[PDB]
Amino acid sequence: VSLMEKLKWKIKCIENKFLNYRLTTNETVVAETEYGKVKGVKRLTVYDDSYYSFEGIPYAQPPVGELRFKAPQRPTPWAGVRDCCNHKDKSVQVDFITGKVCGSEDCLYLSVYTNNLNPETKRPVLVYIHGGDFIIGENHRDMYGPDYFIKKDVVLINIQYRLGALGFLSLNSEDLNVPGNAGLKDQVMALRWIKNNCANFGGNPDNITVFGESAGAASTHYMMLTEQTRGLFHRGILMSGNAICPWANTQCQHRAFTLAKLAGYKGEDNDKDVLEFLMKAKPQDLIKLEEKVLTLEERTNKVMFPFGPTVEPYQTADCVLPKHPREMVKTAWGNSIPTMMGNTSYEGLFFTSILKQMPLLVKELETCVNFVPSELADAERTAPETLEMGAKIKKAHVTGETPTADNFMDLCSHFYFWFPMHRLLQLRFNHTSGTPVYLYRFDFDSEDLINPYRIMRSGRGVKGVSHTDELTYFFWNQLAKRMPKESREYKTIERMTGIWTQFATTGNPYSNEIEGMENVSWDPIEKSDEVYKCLNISDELKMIDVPEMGKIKQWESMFEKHRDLF
Numbered sequence: 383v384s385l386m387e388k389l390k391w392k393i394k395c396i397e398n399k400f401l402n403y404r405l406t407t408n409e410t411v412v413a414e415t416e417y418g419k420v421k422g423v424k425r426l427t428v429y430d431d432s433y434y435s436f437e438g439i440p441y442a443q444p445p446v447g448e449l450r451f452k453a454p455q456r457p458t459p460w461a462g463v464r465d466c467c468n469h470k471d472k473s474v475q476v477d478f479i480t481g482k483v484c485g486s487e488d489c490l491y492l493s494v495y496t497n498n499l500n501p502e503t504k505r506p507v508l509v510y511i512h513g514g515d516f517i518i519g520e521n522h523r524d525m526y527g528p529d530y531f532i533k534k535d536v537v538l539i540n541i542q543y544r545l546g547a548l549g550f551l552s553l554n555s556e557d558l559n560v561p562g563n564a565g566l567k568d569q570v571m572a573l574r575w576i577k578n579n580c581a582n583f584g585g586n587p588d589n590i591t592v593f594g595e596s597a598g599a600a601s602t603h604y605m606m607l608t609e610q611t612r613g614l615f616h617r618g619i620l621m622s623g624n625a626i627c628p629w630a631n632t633q634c635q636h637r638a639f640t641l642a643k644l645a646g647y648k649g650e651d652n653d654k655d656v657l658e659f660l661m662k663a664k665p666q667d668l669i670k671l672e673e674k675v676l677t678l679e680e681r682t683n684k685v686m687f688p689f690g691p692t693v694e695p696y697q698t699a700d701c702v703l704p705k706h707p708r709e710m711v712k713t714a715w716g717n718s719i720p721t722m723m724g725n726t727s728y729e730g731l732f733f734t735s736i737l738k739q740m741p742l743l744v745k746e747l748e749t750c751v752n753f754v755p756s757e758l759a760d761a762e763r764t765a766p767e768t769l770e771m772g773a774k775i776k777k778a779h780v781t782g783e784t785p786t787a788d789n790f791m792d793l794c795s796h797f798y799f800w801f802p803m804h805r806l807l808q809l810r811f812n813h814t815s816g817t818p819v820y821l822y823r824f825d826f827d828s829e830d831l832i833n834p835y836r837i838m839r840s841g842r843g844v845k846g847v848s849h850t851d852e853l854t855y856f857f858w859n860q861l862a863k864r865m866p867k868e869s870r871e872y873k874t875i876e877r878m879t880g881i882w883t884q885f886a887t888t889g890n891p892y893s894n895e896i897e898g899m900e901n902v903s904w905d906p907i908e909k910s911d912e913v914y915k916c917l918n919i920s921d922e923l924k925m926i927d928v929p930e931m932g933k934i935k936q937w938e939s940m941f942e943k944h945r946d947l948f
Contacts, residue, residue, distance in 0.1 A: 417457060427532070428529070442572075479834075506586060506886040525860070529858035534883040550634065554653060596850070642659045712813045771940040796930070820891055821916035826874050831854050834860075
């Protein structure tokens with residue numbers, strides 16, 4: 383990121399402190415939890431709404447010392463009133479703007495927001511699990527402000543969880559108790575806390591909705607698949623991701639050794655010596671070196687990050703993913719709750735930046751062999767079946783003789799999002815009956831209101847609706863501003879928070895109190911449907927055949943001779 387963008391950002395951080403102070407009131411309030419009393423504070427929004435904010439509620443013990451890399455443990459209660467008027471730190475990560483490591487190992491907190499602590503009936507509870515590819519992200523209100531959702535009579539809860547190697551180290555050695563998925567277990571513990579405390583803030587414990595974008599969508603899906611959480615909630619929304627995306631799963635058991643060697647470990651490769659070195663390293667060193675972990679072959683095969691959700695190599699009381707995610711889908715409790723999924727209209731525009739720095743990536747479309755699903759491709763990607771499968775992808779996305787940047791981004795929308803969504807819908811349809819799933823397509827472009835991911839993807843000036851572009855209409859962030867009530871941006875905020883709030887309430891996202899949705903009727907997807915229908919959300923709200931469908935079928939035709947793997 384440029385020095386100019388670094389200065390703008392710093393300035394915005396400073397402005398934000400002042401905006402935050404102005405928006406804070408002297409009305410404090412105390413609420414009860416299973417663990418003790420917490421003190422929150424009422425705050426305003428730039429729309430002159432107001433809400434009670436409780437931040438820094440621990441849902442687990444600080445995962446430090448011998449707790450590093452282990453399943454989270456329940457937090458220790460207190461008497462007195464814990465101060466929750468301030469935010470806690472974020473999980474240790476590289477700051478996307480400054481490129482310096484920030485955060486702290488002491489990051490297992492959640493934040494609770496609502497326009498009314500004593501409503502007359504228990505309200506729908508919405509739980510946001512943030513994205514950031516399992517390596518960045520936070521619940522700070524400078525990027526995930528509840529300002530818009532608190533117009534609605536809901537309780538909104540934003541969680542943190544362990545990221546990177548500290549959340550996702552995995553070791554085969556059973557004696558060590560580092561099976562993997564610590565960060566997802568953080569998520570489970572947070573959802574247990576919410577279940578058992580949401581009533582104290584006016585929330586209905588029998589009507590919880592979990593939602594997330596990108597890796598938060600994968601996370602939400604995982605919360606719908608694991609037995610650890612059976613029955614804990616009642617709706618799920620998967621925004622631009624799910625647990626069977628190729629980026630959402632990795633076998634990272636050999637990678638802890640590599641990480642340790644990068645950090646200076648001297649010795650042989652066994653799990654115990656490797657863990658002991660890692661248990662004593664400074665956390666920022668681990669996180670800083672993590673970008674060097676993956677090999678050239680791994681990157682070429684599109685393994686996105688060294689550490690993430692994995693198949694745990696042995697069972698424990700706290701195991702979250704005992705099998706591959708596909709196999710988990712077959713028996714998932716969450717298959718039986720109302721579900722909404724969707725994507726943006728030009729997801730792969732996100733990768734503009736990566737294309738800038740590596741223009742030769744476009745030549746991967748000459749044969750598209752690097753985009754064939756790794757379960758079907760040979761190791762060197764030189765087999766004749768692999769060239770054939772690559773030709774399906776090429777014919778779907780390469781529009782002229784020579785591939786372009788756009789063809790590459792369009793193919794990416796599919797590889798990363800539309801194709802795994804299709805695999806999931808069909809897989810799910812065969813291992814459930816009845817419970818509806820609804821689709822949306824987010825297709826509203828503006829550069830008047832943005833979020834910080836735009837600075838990360840170097841998308842200033844770039845037309846089309848990228849991965850992350852919808853977040854802007856759900857959450858306040860420090861680059862936002864008060865928009866006129868008549869603005870198309872403002873209307874999109876109301877439509878988005880409105881639809882999400884409707885679905886959370888009844889499990890059906892249709893309502894005719896939402897403007898633009900009067901000549902609409904929003905049917906769920908049926909197992910027999912050959913073409914998917916979605917609510918396309920742009921300046922107009924309109925049901926349409928998913929425009930991506932034709933390409934989706936073409937990707938599917940790569941499994942012609944291996945139907946059992948699709």
